[PDB]
Amino acid sequence: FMVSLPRMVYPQPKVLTPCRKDVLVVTPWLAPIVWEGTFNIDILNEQFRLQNTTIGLTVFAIKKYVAFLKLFLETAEKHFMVGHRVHYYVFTDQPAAVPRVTLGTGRQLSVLEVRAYKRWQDVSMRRMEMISCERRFLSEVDYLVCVDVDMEFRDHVGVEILTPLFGTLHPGFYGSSREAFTYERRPQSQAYIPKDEGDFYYMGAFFGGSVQEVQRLTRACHQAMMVDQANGIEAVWHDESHLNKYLLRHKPTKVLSPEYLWDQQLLGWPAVLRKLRFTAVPKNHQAVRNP
Ligand SMILES: O=c1ccn([C@@H]2O[C@H](COP(=O)(O)OP(=O)(O)O)[C@@H](O)[C@H]2O)c(=O)[nH]1
Ligand SMILES: OC[C@H]1O[C@@H](O)[C@H](O)[C@@H](O)[C@H]1O
Ligand SMILES: [Mn+2]
């Protein structure tokens, strides 16, 4: 049950004036696509604080990737869900390498030790299995957000993203035709998507939803990965290929714009992005992924 919102004074929405004319702000299945200028964060904060919403954030920091945790967590403290209850779940093979970051009130961090796989591909792929400790999240949070660690927050990421199931537009493909999307194209893989199908190319680095929908997604992607393994096939882009297949067949109830997953080194700061909220930290793939 949801109580009434309080009286609030804010600018009237104008029906014959769009917030954004340059971009698509709603998908064909009537899910909002979240860009700056489409939301009044004061209305949304009130809605979600009246539900006493708790947001869980999962992040994996395996082997050398523990080096990314200090910046990831300190910038999350400045920009992620501030004002709301937040539970960070840091999955790592080195609990003593987790930095001691100072947290604001109402925010907590749990360290979950897990095994380290040798291949960076398996480390990345096995997050779906790892996420899918399930009774724990149902008791502790309302929503789960699942992100890469080699990242930093630079601007607001808040309750405008929350919904039963979201994906994020990959910053390399948001202007691309679907034939150019790097979906898995071999019919032998569970992740296969034909050239004439696909709405968007979603990023594996940022998805989330309610706990129920995230466990559905991560269980289905892990099951599909295990089928591929038994068939001796590994999808072209690993968990991201499976996430794409799942979100094609189970449409997300919001889509985040690429404000929410950007790489300023590779892609700069285009005019269509009013804010760069969550961005890649430069790294050397070969060095950081191997001993
Ligand atoms: O040795 C590794 C390789 C990957 N990861 C995790 O898997 C995510 C995805 O891999 P990565 O960021 O390397 O993929 P990219 O964004 O470079 O495609 C990382 O953010 C970490 O959360 C990790 O912890 N240790
Ligand atoms: O083509 C898809 C790939 O695009 C790259 O930019 C990215 O680093 C990979 O993680 C994968 O998303
Ligand atoms: Mn990454």
Tell me what the structure shows.
It is a single-pass type II membrane protein. An alpha-L-fucosyl-(1->2)-beta-D-galactosyl derivative binds at residues 170, 182, 240, 263. GO terms for molecular function: antigen binding; fucosylgalactoside 3-alpha-galactosyltransferase activity; glycoprotein-fucosylgalactoside alpha-N-acetylgalactosaminyltransferase activity; manganese ion binding; nucleotide binding. It is found in: Golgi apparatus, Golgi stack membrane; Secreted. It is an enzyme of class 2 (transferase). It is classed as transferase. There is one protein chain. This protein is α/β, with parallel strands linked by helices. It has one domain (1-291): Spore Coat Polysaccharide Biosynthesis Protein SpsA, Chain A, CATH 3.90.550. Helices cover 27% and strands 16% of the residues. The chain has nine helices and ten strands. The protein has an eight-stranded mixed beta sheet with strand order 1-9-7-8-5-2-3-4. The chain has a two-stranded antiparallel sheet with strand order 6-10. Helix 6 crosses helix 7. The radius of gyration is 19 Å and the shape is globular. 37% of the residues are buried. Bound molecules: uridine-5'-diphosphate, beta-D-galactopyranose and manganese (II) ion. Uridine-5'-diphosphate binds next to strand 2 and helix 3. Manganese (II) ion (MN) binds at residues 148, 150, 205.
